[PDB]
Amino acid sequence: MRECISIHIGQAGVQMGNACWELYCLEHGIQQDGIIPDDSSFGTFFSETGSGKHVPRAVFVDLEQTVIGEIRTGHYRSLFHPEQLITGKEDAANNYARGHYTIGKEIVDSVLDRVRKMADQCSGLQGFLIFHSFGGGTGSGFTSLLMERLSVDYGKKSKLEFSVYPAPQISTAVVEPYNSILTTHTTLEHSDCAFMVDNEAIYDICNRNLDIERPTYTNLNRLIGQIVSSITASLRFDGALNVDLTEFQTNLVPYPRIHFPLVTYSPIISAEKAYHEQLSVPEITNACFEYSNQMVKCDPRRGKYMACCLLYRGDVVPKDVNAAIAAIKTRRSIQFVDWCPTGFKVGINYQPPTVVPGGDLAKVQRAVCMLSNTTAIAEAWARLDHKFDLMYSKRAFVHWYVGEGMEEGEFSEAREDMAALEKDYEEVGTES
Amino acid sequence: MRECISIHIGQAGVQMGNACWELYCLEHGIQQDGIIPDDSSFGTFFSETGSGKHVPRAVFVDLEQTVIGEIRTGHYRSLFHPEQLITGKEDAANNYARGHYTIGKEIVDSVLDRVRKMADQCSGLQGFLIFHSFGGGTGSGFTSLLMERLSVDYGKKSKLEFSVYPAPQISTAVVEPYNSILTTHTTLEHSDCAFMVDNEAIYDICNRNLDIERPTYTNLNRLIGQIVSSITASLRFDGALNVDLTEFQTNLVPYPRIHFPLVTYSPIISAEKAYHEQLSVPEITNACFEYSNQMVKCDPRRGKYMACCLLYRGDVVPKDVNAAIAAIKTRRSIQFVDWCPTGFKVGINYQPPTVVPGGDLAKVQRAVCMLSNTTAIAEAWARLDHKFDLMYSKRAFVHWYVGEGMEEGEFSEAREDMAALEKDYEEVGTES
Amino acid sequence: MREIVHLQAGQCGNQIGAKFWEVISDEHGIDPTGTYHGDSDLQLERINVYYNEATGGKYVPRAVLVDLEPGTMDSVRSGPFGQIFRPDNFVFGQSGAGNNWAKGHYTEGAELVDSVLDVVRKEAESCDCLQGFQLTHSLGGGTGSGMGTLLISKIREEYPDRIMNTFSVVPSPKVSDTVVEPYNATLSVHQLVENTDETYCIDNEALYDICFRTLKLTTPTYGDLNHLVSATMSGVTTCLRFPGQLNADLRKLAVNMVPFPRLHFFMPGFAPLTSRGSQQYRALTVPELTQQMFDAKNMMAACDPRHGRYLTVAAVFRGRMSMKEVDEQMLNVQNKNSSYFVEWIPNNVKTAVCDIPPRGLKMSATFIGNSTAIQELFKRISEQFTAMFRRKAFLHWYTGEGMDEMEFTEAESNMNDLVSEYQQYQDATA
Amino acid sequence: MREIVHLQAGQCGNQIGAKFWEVISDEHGIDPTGTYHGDSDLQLERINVYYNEATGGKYVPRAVLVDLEPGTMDSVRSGPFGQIFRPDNFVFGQSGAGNNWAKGHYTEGAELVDSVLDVVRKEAESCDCLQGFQLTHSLGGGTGSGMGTLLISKIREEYPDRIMNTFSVVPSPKVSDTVVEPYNATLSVHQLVENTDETYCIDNEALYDICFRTLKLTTPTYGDLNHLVSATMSGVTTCLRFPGQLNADLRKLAVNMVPFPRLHFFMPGFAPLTSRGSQQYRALTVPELTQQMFDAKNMMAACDPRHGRYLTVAAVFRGRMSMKEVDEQMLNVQNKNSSYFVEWIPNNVKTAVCDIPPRGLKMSATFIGNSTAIQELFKRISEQFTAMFRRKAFLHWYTGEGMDEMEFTEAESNMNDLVSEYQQYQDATA
Numbered sequence A, B: 001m002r003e004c005i006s007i008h009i010g011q012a013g014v015q016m017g018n019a020c021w022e023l024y025c026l027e028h029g030i031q032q033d034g035i036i037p038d039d040s041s042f043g044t045f046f047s048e049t050g051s052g053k054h055v056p057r058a059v060f061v062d063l064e065q066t067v068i069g070e071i072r073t074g075h076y077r078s079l080f081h082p083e084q085l086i087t088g089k090e091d092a093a094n095n096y097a098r099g100h101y102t103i104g105k106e107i108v109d110s111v112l113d114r115v116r117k118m119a120d121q122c123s124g125l126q127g128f129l130i131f132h133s134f135g136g137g138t139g140s141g142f143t144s145l146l147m148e149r150l151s152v153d154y155g156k157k158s159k160l161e162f163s164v165y166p167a168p169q170i171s172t173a174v175v176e177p178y179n180s181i182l183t184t185h186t187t188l189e190h191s192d193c194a195f196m197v198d199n200e201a202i203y204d205i206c207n208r209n210l211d212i213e214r215p216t217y218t219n220l221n222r223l224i225g226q227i228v229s230s231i232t233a234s235l236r237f238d239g240a241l242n243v244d245l246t247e248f249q250t251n252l253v254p255y256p257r258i259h260f261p262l263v264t265y266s267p268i269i270s271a272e273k274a275y276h277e278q279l280s281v282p283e284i285t286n287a288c289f290e291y292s293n294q295m296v297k298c299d300p301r302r303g304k305y306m307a308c309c310l311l312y313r314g315d316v317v318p319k320d321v322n323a324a325i326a327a328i329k330t331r332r333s334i335q336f337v338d339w340c341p342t343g344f345k346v347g348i349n350y351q352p353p354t355v356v357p358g359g360d361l362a363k364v365q366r367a368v369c370m371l372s373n374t375t376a377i378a379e380a381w382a383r384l385d386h387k388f389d390l391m392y393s394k395r396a397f398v399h400w401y402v403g404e405g406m407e408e409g410e411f412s413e414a415r416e417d418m419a420a421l422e423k424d425y426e427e428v429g430t431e432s
Numbered sequence C, D: 001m002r003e004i005v006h007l008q009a010g011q012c013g014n015q016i017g018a019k020f021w022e023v024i025s026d027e028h029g030i031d032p033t034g035t036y037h038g039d040s041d042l043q044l045e046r047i048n049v050y051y052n053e054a055t056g057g058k059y060v061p062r063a064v065l066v067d068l069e070p071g072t073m074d075s076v077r078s079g080p081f082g083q084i085f086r087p088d089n090f091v092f093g094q095s096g097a098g099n100n101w102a103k104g105h106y107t108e109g110a111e112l113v114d115s116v117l118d119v120v121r122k123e124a125e126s127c128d129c130l131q132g133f134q135l136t137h138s139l140g141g142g143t144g145s146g147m148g149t150l151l152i153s154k155i156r157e158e159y160p161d162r163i164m165n166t167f168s169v170v171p172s173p174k175v176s177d178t179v180v181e182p183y184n185a186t187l188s189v190h191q192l193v194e195n196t197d198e199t200y201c202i203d204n205e206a207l208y209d210i211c212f213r214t215l216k217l218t219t220p221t222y223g224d225l226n227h228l229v230s231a232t233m234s235g236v237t238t239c240l241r242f243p244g245q246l247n248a249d250l251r252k253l254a255v256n257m258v259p260f261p262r263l264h265f266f267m268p269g270f271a272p273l274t275s276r277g278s279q280q281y282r283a284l285t286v287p288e289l290t291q292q293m294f295d296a297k298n299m300m301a302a303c304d305p306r307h308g309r310y311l312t313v314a315a316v317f318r319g320r321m322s323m324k325e326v327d328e329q330m331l332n333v334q335n336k337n338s339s340y341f342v343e344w345i346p347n348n349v350k351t352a353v354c355d356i357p358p359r360g361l362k363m364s365a366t367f368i369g370n371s372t373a374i375q376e377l378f379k380r381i382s383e384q385f386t387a388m389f390r391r392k393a394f395l396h397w398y399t400g401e402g403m404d405e406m407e408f409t410e411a412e413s414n415m416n417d418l419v420s421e422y423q424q425y426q427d428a429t430a
């Protein structure tokens, strides 16, 4: 199978990626020095060279020099091609306008050049994985830019992303609703499907299951690394019933706008706690169908599932996966919409996970990642829309935007567009 | 034969269970470290794992962290799955209302989740053994909760329990009658049969037969361990005329409400004292039919037996069991009710008891446990009802309950319900 | 030719079954691995009467083992003799009956009976001429009483013409190993009189009386009582498996031993029975053998034949013997105890002689009797049933599994009629 | 003489293909390097039925492997058995279909189909008498469903006279491994009824039911399910490759098994199937073999034959056998289950016997059936399709690759007619 390009935008995406690429190095046994120790898989995510040093096929962009500087000076400095690390001069300062209109465009073209110079050097190409956040300038405004530009230059190719959605109650910035909605509007028409994640839900899981009292960003971003490696496992490792990258959108996207499947991973168990667990197929399969196991803090029983992919990993029994899924289809609490009787998409790859040195999670012999699309996520959008209406009703932060080349009417258009999305979910939530 | 789930609620049930599970470990030779030393029986009470460490199939709940903390830090810490040990923050304080209405419900759902996650992982399931007391908050109020919840989620499956009934004269709390009656009312409609035991009777036996002057809870709870292992012997060990778990209720429960068979065990003899005894079948069989051998201090000759099970253990002679029982049926002092000529239920398992290291009781080659249901137990209820009338007549403790979300009328309803039970025994005590 | 398919239900049935197949494998000289290792050609001429053949000499007996829970079957499969049986023939549930008839007949046995029929039919189609069905169960239990009566009816519907006989353990007179025996016992008889051709009633107390009285072996475990029962039932089918001077047949006994359709309950008997050591001070000639068949002391039914009257009697002898004595003694027996036999039947004794005696013996006679004294047993069950049912002692365990108390009244009324019918023939002619 | 050219499309087709060629190489005794090392001259007499010959004894099978992306083909080439295939026959794209029918049939499959035809023609011209084409694919997928239907039409146009049969995996009744199976499944049937002569419908759920039920092998990977499918398809072509008493032919089965042109969907079956270890307690004679072919338990199609009625049935036996029983049992089978067969066809069973049994066995029978009960499957797909299409659930992924929703309506309408046609023959004569 063939190549994929990973774009890491903003502090969150850039910081998340460094953890993700640590896994790829471990799985294929690539040295942090870049030189593979003395096979057909790494070609998808790594570029060959005359020497033994493989070059990762990804680009990092961040208007603030600080974040990339840590990578550019960290022990992984030699792994990345120096010209792939694009850095501006000043930060976007959490303002959507700066990262999209004034300073985002001053460096966007340079990023396109390297991607173009990178996409041209792959005999095959699947799509893009874009890592970013919803609550920052570079990770929200610059993302919207690249979705537009990459859509034009490389349209009709898959465009996937993993976005840190604003958590329900915990908040890390004041202008998250303003910046969160804006990027959503511009990215709906130029994206395939977004893999939402919340730090609140992940924190809730980490203190609950993993059983470590004091998590950090350096900890959580690694779990987000596992979902990516499991998602991209088909493109690298052989196994029965593979699932190529272009397959995700077809199964998980009944409608063009409705492309927000929240991520769910299992089993998250610590090394010590695992000795008293059996890890049967239904056990791990059942873990994905409860409020207590989500990367987004949306109560699934509030809504109805409409598409679910169970990308199994490691030594797995297809017979049990077929049987385990069948039971979940016949439980009253679980409720698939009326119009999608065919609501599962199984995928198996014969490569059990690999543990990061010193990693908190255990060495599970078998793993599964669920990518269910549920109408309960409309609550997250509904709550977010409530926040935006409260602030913009008083016009309490617009001035920071109008001064950066963003017209007043944009805010009104976005919410009205989001309001239609709210109704779109409601219509799909019923049966004609 | 297949699985059973043991629930240990309250300080008494939790403390009793730790002694019971010590026997199971010894009988099957399971190490306290959890790893079986380098067969088909332990599957009933123990869950397999990829490693050699078997996980006991039981759940421990106690609103007071102190009791479970001792187990969670004792030498048996590794045996139990960490998530099976459910602990609250504050004690129930001997109040029925707290353990049933205010703080009992704050943690009941978590217990149901683990049982549900545990009942789902057994190909077969027989029922539940619930260990608790009548004179505490967690062991009385939380029990009533689980009887209700487990009845709904797993109705029509056997629900057995071993309850420490309030002793006639020795008392360990002031509000035993208030808390004792309340749990009885709520558990009658959601239970199969209760195996009553009294510390007074057990103490009377221990100083009388076992011949040790200074017994303790750590001592008595072990004898209660023997009755459980003998009762559950059929589900584990092969032998002629087995008696499955669901068989107990049919033989011992002529009527739905009348399901209180008091326990009786024999022979309780010390290691030194045993060398001068022969232990013939009639000898051990005769020991179970006198006032001097009961786990509940009710004089049997006051009432009439209406159902009796003799679950023989070890190398036994079915011919003698048939002959020994016949003689007991033809003694004037012994008096079965007129309407139950068929008043015996024999069961033999080829597994003589095992001795706890340092145990006081001897290494009997043969054992028997009797579970007779007698109308003399109505005296225990009758005496208990007298205590409740005296206190509630003066309304001398209601205030501690009304402040914990328990209405005044509940006390009146319970006694009136108990009064009907008193009359129910009286009607069954005569012949139409 | 006249193949027998064996059915075993309940813990008692499987345990008796398990012993029952050890002896037949011993008689035919079959190795526990399924490989024939006998010494007489007569063992292979009829080895198809019980055993199917798979290539390689592996003889697979056609027994159908059903119990609502894996408890007793797992022991059989783990036992030394358990490898012989076909893995498929074992049928196991996951929740055994709690001794209550309703659960094992209506709610739990129903979910499993269809699975059993799927295998019984395969056995039926594999036999060129399937004679009949044989069932070993117990009335006291739930699985044996419930699913046995549920299954005996189903096989009755499919093959009405074939014989369908049963060996059942019956509640003892003064001891009971289950509290609710009268309910299960009465319910099971109602469903049996209407569907089974013959029933060899046995009870543990009567068989206990044999262990210490005529034999001297205290502490006789169930593993030994079943051997006596095993031997008796193997005698009934001997003529189908070995030559003889006067061959019998499962249908031959039914015709002679059943005057009227409903009165088909027999009570068996076996000889010679003598304790080891003292055996050498007794002779093995026919005369002393015959007297041992017509005394209550050697009856495996608790009811004493003296109190009642004999209707029909069948003696199935084995081994080289004088046919004169095998018929002279019966004539003397009938004249000695003419009062013990009813007058309206001119002759009551049926004789059959086989050539091959039991393994380890040179003489054997499986007595069978159809006496009116059995009415005392059913009358006793009627006495116990009316006492309990007069107060609805345990009806709630039964009505809670899809049953109506109307059925209990129907079974009690039918049982009383069965007792009455036996009584009507106490009187003499005219 | 009657050469077969094998076509495999999609991940399921290649994986079944890969196993499918291992067995045939095993039957003929062909070394993985391509060098014949068998022991029977009958393996070389017909080695040209599947294998071309290059100088030096290197036998190159004439299979055409097509997948829109190198994923599955690369595994085959790297597999232990992958060296046998010709390097040119592999045809690989650079962007696999995302399970959507349109991309693999119109926009991506079109750019690759012409390349495949260039190689299929070379195989066709190399055979003195090319009997027909064989396709192994899956309806659920995009590459197998799309390019298989695209390619089955193209080869149909060039060689209308030749046989063109297919083995396809069909959506399971209650489990689905792809969300959009009904769309791909319905679209693929519409294009197949009009172009293929026969189709052996199989589904994983039914084949799963075999793994644990009759066999006892939990955790059966796809590598084992394909072996069952491999064995069945190799049975259909046996007579073309080895002598027999009553030889069959790909056209022989088509004539007998296809009353009307459209009603050519069959459902296969195989025997003997027994778990290892327990195998020795079962006989291998013809009678028990035949009963195993006419029970739902050994049907590889989820639809249960009992609900419907049989139209035509073909039993292809193998190995030294008694032709009497091979035809006596069919007569008894038809009279036993006369209700299971329609009256308007006087006889329905087709028998064929071959001399060489499967490797490692001395008896084998690949059952084939044409029953009306299959209409339930297509009716089920119709139920799912109308539900999704009633709201345009996923139409935008399809219309975005050069397609119009009018085609979906055409496929649904045609599918309903196919279901109706089967229903019309439920009724009896007159």
Ligand SMILES: Nc1nc2c(ncn2[C@@H]2O[C@H](COP(=O)(O)OP(=O)(O)OP(=O)(O)O)[C@@H](O)[C@H]2O)c(=O)[nH]1
Residues within 6 Å of the ligand: A009, A010, A011, A012, A013, A015, A016, A063, A064, A091, A092, A093, A094, A095, A133, A134, A135, A136, A137, A138, A139, A140, A164, A165, A166, A172, A199, A217, A218, A220, A221, A224
């Ligand atoms: N999971 C995860 N989330 C992060 C990480 N770093 C930041 N976040 C989240 O990202 C959001 C803040 O956005 P950032 O990415 O820091 O901001 P930025 O993209 O650099 O944008 P500006 O600094 O405003 O230009 C908050 O929701 C943070 O919780 C990380 O390493 N992992």
Ligand SMILES: Nc1nc2c(ncn2[C@@H]2O[C@H](COP(=O)(O)OP(=O)(O)OP(=O)(O)O)[C@@H](O)[C@H]2O)c(=O)[nH]1
Residues within 6 Å of the ligand: B009, B010, B011, B012, B013, B015, B016, B063, B064, B091, B092, B093, B094, B095, B099, B132, B133, B134, B135, B136, B137, B138, B139, B140, B164, B165, B166, B172, B199, B217, B218, B220, B221, B224
């Ligand atoms: N047999 C036995 N009885 C016990 C044990 N511990 C307590 N009891 C009895 O249980 C009753 C007291 O109830 P506890 O179990 O201590 O109270 P609790 O269930 O923890 O309820 P609260 O503490 O009020 O929440 C008294 O009758 C004690 O004699 C024990 O280890 N063994």
Ligand SMILES: Nc1nc2c(ncn2[C@@H]2O[C@H](COP(=O)(O)OP(=O)(O)O)[C@@H](O)[C@H]2O)c(=O)[nH]1
Residues within 6 Å of the ligand: B240, B241, B242, C009, C010, C011, C012, C013, C015, C016, C097, C099, C138, C140, C141, C142, C143, C144, C145, C169, C177, C204, C222, C223, C225, C226, C229
């Ligand atoms: N002869 C004999 N009788 C038995 C044996 N085991 C149990 N029984 C009798 O069977 C009756 C109990 O029924 P059981 O078959 O265990 O119950 P079920 O499993 O529900 O049918 C009692 O009358 C026992 O005396 C045995 O091994 N041999």
Ligand SMILES: Nc1nc2c(ncn2[C@@H]2O[C@H](COP(=O)(O)OP(=O)(O)O)[C@@H](O)[C@H]2O)c(=O)[nH]1
Residues within 6 Å of the ligand: A240, A241, A242, D009, D010, D011, D012, D013, D015, D016, D097, D098, D099, D138, D140, D141, D142, D143, D144, D145, D169, D171, D177, D178, D204, D222, D223, D225, D226
């Ligand atoms: N029997 C069998 N079925 C398979 C195998 N692999 C995939 N499938 C089935 O094929 C379907 C998925 O289609 P696939 O061929 O992977 O998609 P495509 O590559 O787009 O044609 C599902 O119904 C799977 O159950 C296999 O190895 N054996």
Ligand SMILES: [Mg+2]
Residues within 6 Å of the ligand: A010, A011, A064, A091, A136, A138
């Ligand atoms: Mg930043």
